[PDB]
């Protein structure tokens, strides 16, 4: 176990415990999720009795607002979701009109 | 002994190198990632090429960056793009001649 030559640790790992190994993964993973264009699904539990067919609505309500489902529905309406470009028209729609 | 097409074709590719210099990026200091104020400037380029007009006007500012071997995205800061577009027209000319 060394402290020098790039004055640090080198063989085996560095001085990287299990936490450091996992943290290295935890970094790349999170950074790489940011590297992409996400699309989401949000799913709701019906009742806590593991019962099919039945649904409780207090249970939905409590889930909805805390996950900000309303705000998502509110921003999708208010916003302008796709910031694209002009030239896209003139070329492709010469065929059209 | 040029074909009747190729007459216009060589002029098409050659003339864009005048057109490209028009793309006037403008400072919007909230990050410095400028997007150019117009479309006609780069459309007169696009049409003469028949490259995907959407691919053009988007990709110029936000391209897929090869990072090591994987893929990330980025907006280019103002001057980075301004010069990088000027690179494009001179890139066509070296190749065309």
UniProtKB/Swiss-Prot annotation, chain A:
Gene name of the encoded protein: MYH7
Subcellular localization: Cytoplasm, Myofibril; Cytoplasm, Myofibril, Sarcomere
Signal peptide interval: none
Note: The cardiac alpha isoform is a 'fast' ATPase myosin, while the beta isoform is a 'slow' ATPase.
Quaternary structure (record): Muscle myosin is a hexameric protein that consists of 2 heavy chain subunits (MHC), 2 alkali light chain subunits (MLC) and 2 regulatory light chain subunits (MLC-2). Interacts with ECPAS. Interacts (via C-terminus) with LRRC39.
Renumbered residue ranges of the record's region Actin-binding: 26-48
Disease: Cardiomyopathy, familial hypertrophic, 1: A hereditary heart disorder characterized by ventricular hypertrophy, which is usually asymmetric and often involves the interventricular septum. The symptoms include dyspnea, syncope, collapse, palpitations, and chest pain. They can be readily provoked by exercise. The disorder has inter- and intrafamilial variability ranging from benign to malignant forms with high risk of cardiac failure and sudden cardiac death.
Record-stated family: Belongs to the TRAFAC class myosin-kinesin ATPase superfamily. Myosin family.
Origin species: Homo sapiens (Human)
Domain remark from Swiss-Prot or TrEMBL: The rodlike tail sequence is highly repetitive, showing cycles of a 28-residue repeat pattern composed of 4 heptapeptides, characteristic for alpha-helical coiled coils.
Summary of the function given for this chain in its UniProt record: Myosins are actin-based motor molecules with ATPase activity essential for muscle contraction. Forms regular bipolar thick filaments that, together with actin thin filaments, constitute the fundamental contractile unit of skeletal and cardiac muscle.
Protein name per the record: Myosin-7
Residue pairs linked by disulfide bridges in the UniProt entry: none
Curated annotation (Swiss-Prot), chain B:
Residue numbers carrying Phosphothreonine: 39
Subcellular location: Cytoplasm, Myofibril; Cytoplasm, Myofibril, Sarcomere
Annotated transmembrane regions: none
Function: Myosins are actin-based motor molecules with ATPase activity essential for muscle contraction. Forms regular bipolar thick filaments that, together with actin thin filaments, constitute the fundamental contractile unit of skeletal and cardiac muscle.
Annotated domain remarks: The rodlike tail sequence is highly repetitive, showing cycles of a 28-residue repeat pattern composed of 4 heptapeptides, characteristic for alpha-helical coiled coils.
Disease entry from the Swiss-Prot or TrEMBL record: Cardiomyopathy, familial hypertrophic, 1: A hereditary heart disorder characterized by ventricular hypertrophy, which is usually asymmetric and often involves the interventricular septum. The symptoms include dyspnea, syncope, collapse, palpitations, and chest pain. They can be readily provoked by exercise. The disorder has inter- and intrafamilial variability ranging from benign to malignant forms with high risk of cardiac failure and sudden cardiac death.
Oligomeric form and interacting partners: Muscle myosin is a hexameric protein that consists of 2 heavy chain subunits (MHC), 2 alkali light chain subunits (MLC) and 2 regulatory light chain subunits (MLC-2). Interacts with ECPAS. Interacts (via C-terminus) with LRRC39.
Further remarks about this protein from its record: The cardiac alpha isoform is a 'fast' ATPase myosin, while the beta isoform is a 'slow' ATPase.
Protein name: Myosin-7
Protein's organism: Homo sapiens (Human)
Name of the gene this protein is made from: MYH7
